[PDB]
Design a protein around this ligand. Structure first.
Ligand code: 90N
Length: 284
């Protein structure tokens, strides 16, 4: 099963995430290695226990460079804990917003290739994420991006971006919004939004539009416009992730292949899609 870790091997050092029913800590695991530690406070319900240990059970079934690695669990003692590798740079959305403009286009596309490789693995393993977004991607000190936030009902219930069907509207495919059809192809829609998040350094999708306004625009055929300084091939790819007809979207294998070829011939990324300015600056 999973590795059972003795509480004496774990030292919690600093809170990096918090909720009403536990916290996420940076800590050390016994040379000691840095880890992330998530706890479940006393009084937890049966459903909370199944959801909590269920995330660890899912993560322990995976072994991939771009999927967060499980070190082990504390289940024989209280409080219960899940221990994973520690991703030094935190969540991808916050990371990009705090490092605006600091990366090369090739670095940004390499991030997307890693996310896509992780998603290809998950999809082939018959795991549908349902909440793919930059906020659920973690970044380490090698700039490697890893998919996180696993489970069944707990994923969308725990995400504040998911609003009441409780769903994060501006990341979610139309069929998942409309009739709750969550598949790897709705994950591909979300991946397209993640591509846009990365290339904009974490801009909020659709900006200030309301959730109802987003669904209306999508149904009317509108799509997010090109980011600034965005390779034409990258904008083309995210546009095809946003096809209304699920069956026409690329599969993650297609996405990984295209991204791998663009990175291997990096001059291909120098051709930029046109950017629509919202403001004209005239000078005589
Ligand atoms: C600049 C600066 N300073 C400090 N002190 N610390 C940081 N890093 C962070 O704040 C930070 C923020 C969010 C996430 C992380 N790294 C994480 N790595 C793994 C995490 C994690 O949640 N793992 C996990 C997952 C994904 C599922 C179940 C259980 C666990 Cl334990 S969180 C670090 N950055």
């Amino acid at each position: 099963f999973t590795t059972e870790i003795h509480p004496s091997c774990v030292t919690r050092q600093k809170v990096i995430g918090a909720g009403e029913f536990g916290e996420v800590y940076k800590g050390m695991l016994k040379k000691e290695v840095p880890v992330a530690i998530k706890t479940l406070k006393a009084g937890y319900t049966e459903k909370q226990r199944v959801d909590f240990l269920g995330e660890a059970g899912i993560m322990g079934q995976f072994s991939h460079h771009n999927i967060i690695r499980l070190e082990g669990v504390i289940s024989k003692y209280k409080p219960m804990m899940i221990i994973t590798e520690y991703m030094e740079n935190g969540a991808l959305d916050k990371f990009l917003r705090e490092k605006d403009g600091e990366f090369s286009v090739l670095q940004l596309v390499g991030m997307l290739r890693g996310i896509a490789a992780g998603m290809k693995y998950l999809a082939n393993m018959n795991y549908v994420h349902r909440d793919l977004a930059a906020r659920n991607i973690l970044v380490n000190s090698n700039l490697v991006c890893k998919v996180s936030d696993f489970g069944l009902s707990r994923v969308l219930e725990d995400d504040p971006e998911a609003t009441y069907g409780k769903i994060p509207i501006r990341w979610t495919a139309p069929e998942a919004i409309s009739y709750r059809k969550f598949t790897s192809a709705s994950d591909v829609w979300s991946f397209g939004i993640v591509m846009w998040e990365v290339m904009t350094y974490g801009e909020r999708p659709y900006w200030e539009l309301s959730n109802h306004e987003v669904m209306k625009a999508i149904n009317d055929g509108f799509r997010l416009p090109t980011p600034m300084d965005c390779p034409s091939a990258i904008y083309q790819l995210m546009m095809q992730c946003w096809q209304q007809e699920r069956a026409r979207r690329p599969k993650f294998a297609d996405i990984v292949s295209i991204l791998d070829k663009l990175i291997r011939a990096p001059d291909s990324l120098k051709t930029l899609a046109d950017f629509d300015p919202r403001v004209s600056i005239r000078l005589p």
